[PDB]
Every structure is written in C-alpha cells, then in structure tokens.
Amino acid sequence: DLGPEQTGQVIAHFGVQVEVESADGQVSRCHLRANLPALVTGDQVVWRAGGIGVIVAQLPRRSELCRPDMRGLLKPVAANVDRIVIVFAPRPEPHANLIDRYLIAAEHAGIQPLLLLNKADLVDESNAEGIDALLNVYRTLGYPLIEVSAFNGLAMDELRGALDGHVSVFVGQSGVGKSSLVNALLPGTARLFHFPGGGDLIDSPGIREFGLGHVSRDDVEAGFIEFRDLLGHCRFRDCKHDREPGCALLQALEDGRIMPQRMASYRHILASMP
Numbered sequence: 001d002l003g004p005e006q007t008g009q010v011i012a013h014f015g016v017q018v019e020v021e022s023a024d025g026q027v028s029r030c031h032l033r034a035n036l037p038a039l040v041t042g043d044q045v046v047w048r049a050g051g052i053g054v055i056v057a058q059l060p061r062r063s064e065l066c067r068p069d070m071r072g073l074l075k076p077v078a079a080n081v082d083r084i085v086i087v088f089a090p091r092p093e094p095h096a097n098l099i100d101r102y103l104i105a106a107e108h109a110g111i112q113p114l115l116l117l118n119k120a121d122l123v124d125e126s127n128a129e130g131i132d133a134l135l136n137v138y139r140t141l142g143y144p145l146i147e148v149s150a151f152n153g154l155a156m157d158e159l160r161g162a163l164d165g166h167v168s169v170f171v172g173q174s175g176v177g178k179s180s181l182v183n184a185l186l187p188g189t190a191r192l193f194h195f196p197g198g199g200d201l202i203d204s205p206g207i208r209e210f211g212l213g214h215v216s217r218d219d220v221e222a223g224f225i226e227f228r229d230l231l232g233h234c235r236f237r238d239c240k241h242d243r244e245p246g247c248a249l250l251q252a253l254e255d256g257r258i259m260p261q262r263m264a265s266y267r268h269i270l271a272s273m274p
C-alpha cells in the first residue's frame, strides 16, 4: 500500500523519520527510502502517503547552508535558504572583521545577506560617530541594513516585512539578541518555522554559530563586492595586492572605490587563512 505522489517541504529530521509539511498546511511523518540522498531541513521533496509516508524523491536545492563536521569538513545543515540575517549590536562591540566574515560566508553559500543592527535603543550620541561610520560602510556597498530593537520594538514591522516571502537564517556573535529576536518574531537539529507576518525560518543552536572557517584566497576576494569586478586586471596575474604596481585594487583604493576599513580586514582575514 502507498497513496499517490505529493510535493512537500522538510520541517524536522528525526533520524530514520522526517517531518513533512504540504501546501495544504498539514504535517505528516515519512520514512526515508533507501536510495535517497542525504536530507536536511528546508529541502524540497516528493513523497507518498500511507499516517506514515515514504519520501520518494528529492527536488533540486536552490541553496545550501553548510557547517563543520565532527572531522572538520563542511556538511549541509539547511537547504533552500535565500536570506542570511547577520545580527550585531552596539553591545557587545561590532567589528568590521567579523561582519566582513559573515558577508563572505553568505557569498560562499550563494545566499543573499541582510545586516541587522539590533539593540538600537542603545545608540547614544556618544556611539553614533563610531556606529554610523561602520553602518554606512555596508550601506555604500549596496547591502540591505536595518536598525532595530527587540527590546523597544523599534522597526520590527519592517523586519517582518523584510523576512516576508523568504526563508531566513539568524546568524551573529553570541549576545547580540538572536534568541530575543526570534522570540519577538515567533511569540509562541534544524527545524522550520513560519513567521505569522509571512516567510519562514530555519533554526538550531548549530546554525546560530554558523560563520567562516578556512577557505581559499580567491574565495575571500570574491567575498568583497568591490573586488569582484576588478580581479584579473592587475597586470601581474600573480599579484598579491601589496606594494605591487599595476594592482587594480590599489588604484581603486586611491580613487576611493575601495574603503581602507575594508582593504584592512581583507588583509587581516586573508592572513588568518593558511
């Protein structure tokens, strides 16, 4: 016995079994057919019913969020995420370095980012010279940025709007309010939840620690939008972009098409990779 084929999305992964939600808005547990590739939360599948179903086939993923293995290798932990929400705050102090890192991860994963200044209620006149400075570094790169407070409620209906129609992941250093933010947007391994205003979320303590490990220099360079356009124009195809004339990047910095705050963390980060 097996009912007809159906289209659905993966909600939870209970090892041998998988929680699956359909377009109808109904949930069912489905066993995993043997031949089937590895599945993660967010994946789109074909299944048949029987209250237990059988997952028959996996539909292509649009995107993948990976995470380091027990060994140290990257294995996917979520699928079909189209937005990564990078959350920082006035406290603890935000550094360009870690932000520039999460921005690279988002590029490596092939997923569009969205920066979030949480704890905007803590933006004193004292902080603003230092804060508006850093915000407008990513504002002038074309990146989406919102200033919010999961304490106040400041600009939360814009975030709910920014999250509408997307599948989103919440990522940032600990203590910026990731838990507080989820709870504010959802009052009551990777699991998938739906925002009441619209859009979905995939969450787990492991995905929250999602960031950047060791990669290639050419990966890192691709993580800088200013860079992507120029790379391959430095005359020296062997250019290291350091004291080298004919370095397109260098000329760009001079002209102001690269910001020194960025050209710095590029050096700091690349020199952290082996």
Ligand SMILES: Nc1nc2c(ncn2[C@@H]2O[C@H](COP(=O)(O)OP(=O)(O)O)[C@@H](O)[C@H]2O)c(=O)[nH]1
Pocket: 118, 119, 120, 121, 122, 148, 149, 150, 151, 152, 173, 174, 175, 176, 177, 178, 179, 180, 181
């Ligand atoms: N002042 C202020 N504090 C906040 C805000 N959002 C979160 N917090 C505080 O930040 C601290 C850490 O929050 P939490 O969600 O646990 O951070 P997480 O480690 O990133 O999940 C908590 O004590 C919260 O009260 C905010 O908008 N304003």
Ligand SMILES: [Zn+2]
Pocket: 234, 239, 240, 241, 242, 244, 246, 247, 248, 249, 250
């Ligand atoms: Zn160069």
